[PDB]
From Swiss-Prot, chain A:
Top-level taxonomy: Viruses, Duplodnaviria, Heunggongvirae, Uroviricota, Caudoviricetes
Role noted for this protein: Forms the tail multi-ring barrel with ring protein 1, ring protein 3 and ring protein 4.
UniProt KW keywords: Virion
The keyword Manganese belongs to this UniProt entry's keyword annotation: no
Coiled-coil segments on the chain, per record: none
Protein name: Ring protein 2
Species the sequence originates in: Bacteroides phage crAss001
Curated annotation (Swiss-Prot), chain B:
Principal location: virion
Annotated compartments: Virion
Naturally occurring in which organism (per UniProt): Bacteroides phage crAss001 (Bacteroides phage PhiCrAss001)
SUBUNIT field: Homododecamer.
Alphabetically ordered keywords of this record: Virion
Note: The barrel is composed of five stacked dodecameric ring structures. Podoviridae-like phages usually possess only one such ring. The tail is thus rather long.
Function: Forms the tail multi-ring barrel with ring protein 1, ring protein 2 and ring protein 4.
Protein known as: Ring protein 3
GO CC annotation terms, alphabetical: virion component
Domain of life per record: Viruses
Keyword Ligase attached: no
Length: 225, 226
């Protein structure tokens, strides 16, 4: 399913069809993207369960070599990093950075804290490690100077913001899908009816609430105007 | 009832040329009031606003048998070329010019992008202009292989917004009734553009209801200042 189908299901359940409606489809996109992460955490955080393939998305990143701090000699070895800021993954799925082929290569996505201290094991000196720095970029680290030649990776994970990771979606065979509404929403069908129910409950009450409608330099909500 | 019977029964009901006070009308006023009663009655019946029936266009066999003789079906494949619409995939079709209300309305699609669903009979959904912007991208209420959006515009036109090409336009409407003219009118006079005698085309069942409504209209006409 696509963003369009979910959005218009929510709108039609709410009957927000007129262009002169207070709650636009943008409210629907916001609520859908947040309630998706809410439901996924509620279902896949208590105890470890199988996560379907629908909850995931693949972003494609372009890597650039950057200094550790600045251009000094003693400031440590350089890191690669994605050109643009990367979405934050949830901790419920199977995050994986792969070199444009999911079935090959070993690039390990680890925590920020762990990546401070990796590769000291002599047999793990050739493994590329990944983490999202507080800067918001995906930083790469390894002890094997060959890693700095890496130019492109794809990252598959259950990203915490469907909109961000869908905007960073990888080019399809036909070409890029410009409109977000024509892209595919990241959620299993078994979680779609609950998601629609939660969003529709969220906006049902506000839909029929009064407005401060008189232009009279006055607050008109206490009078239910 | 025939025109002679309309006239005679109408005179009898008004007690024309009786000893008590009464009303005598010319055949032209009989035609005027009978036509007004006819159109008012059938509009009220279509809209369901008649208290005596309280029923809509095809909601019972009674109303079916009343307005069965006004429903006409129309086909057209000619598209008006030069017009301004609210969508690139918008085509315009002319209305038969005698329509009052469109009750059934259908479009046939001929597009190579429809696979083996060519000629799919698509329902024409009349949409308000508020809903149009948010219905263009609707995948459940917008244009599709099974949906066409129709908007009324000036010059008696129908803007059909469709995702696929529209070749034909099938429609069923309530038609203009032939007025009730009881006498060939002199030069200059006419009712609904008709000058000669013109018999009611509805069923004989509703002719008497038309008669009593015409009588009440005449009484109101002659007794609205007294």
């Amino acid at each position: 399913m696509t963003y369009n189908e979910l959005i218009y299901m929510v709108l039609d359940e709410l009957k927000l069809s007129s262009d002169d409606s207070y709650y636009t489809p943008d409210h629907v996109i916001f609520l859908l993207v947040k309630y998706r992460s809410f439901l996924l955490k509620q279902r896949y955080s208590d105890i470890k369960k199988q996560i379907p393939d629908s909850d995931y998305q693949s972003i494609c990143l372009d890597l650039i070599e950057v200094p550790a701090i600045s251009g000094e000699p003693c400031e440590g070895s350089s890191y690669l990093r994605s050109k643009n800021k990367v979405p934050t993954t949830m901790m419920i799925g199977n995050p994986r950075v792969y070199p444009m082929d999911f079935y090959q290569g070993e690039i390990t996505y680890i925590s920020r804290d762990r990546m401070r201290y990796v590769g000291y094991n002599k047999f793990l000196r050739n493994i590329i490690y990944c983490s999202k720095a507080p800067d918001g970029y995906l930083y790469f680290k390894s002890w094997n100077p060959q890693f700095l030649h890496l130019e492109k990776v794809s990252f598959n994970a259950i990203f915490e913001d469907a909109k961000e990771a869908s905007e960073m979606a990888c080019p399809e065979e036909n070409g890029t899908i410009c409109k977000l509404e024509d892209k595919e929403f990241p959620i299993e069908d078994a979680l779609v009816p609950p998601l629609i129910e939660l969003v529709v409950k969220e906006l049902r009450g506000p839909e029929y609430s009064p407005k401060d409608e008189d232009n009279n330099a006055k607050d008109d909500l206490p009078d239910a105007r | 009832m025939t025109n002679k019977e309309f006239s005679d029964g109408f005179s009898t009901l008004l007690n024309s040329f009786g000893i008590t006070p009464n009303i005598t009308l010319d055949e032209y006023e009989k035609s005027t009031f009978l036509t007004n009663a006819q159109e008012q009655l059938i509009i009220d019946i279509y809209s369901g606003r008649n208290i005596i029936y309280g029923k809509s266009f095809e909601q019972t066999e009674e109303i079916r048998r009343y307005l069965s003789n006004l429903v006409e079906t129309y086909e057209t494949s000619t598209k008006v070329t030069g017009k301004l619409g609210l969508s690139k995939d918008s085509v315009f079709f002319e209305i038969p010019q005698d329509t009052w209300f469109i009750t059934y309305e259908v479009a046939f699609l001929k597009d190579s992008r429809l696979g083996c669903l060519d000629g799919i009979e698509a329902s024409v959904v009349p949409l308000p202009q508020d809903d149009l912007y948010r219905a263009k991208d609707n995948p459940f209420r917008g244009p599709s292989k099974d949906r066409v959006l129709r908007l009324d515009i000036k010059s008696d036109l129908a803007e059909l917004i469709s995702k696929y090409n529209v070749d034909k336009y099938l429609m069923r409407y309530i038609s203009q009734p032939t007025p009730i003219i009881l006498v060939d009118l002199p030069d200059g006079l006419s009712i609904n553009g008709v000058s000669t005698e013109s018999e009611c085309e509805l069923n004989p069942v509703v002719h008497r209801a038309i008669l009593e409504r015409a009588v009440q209209l005449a009484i109101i006409s002659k007794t609205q200042l007294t």
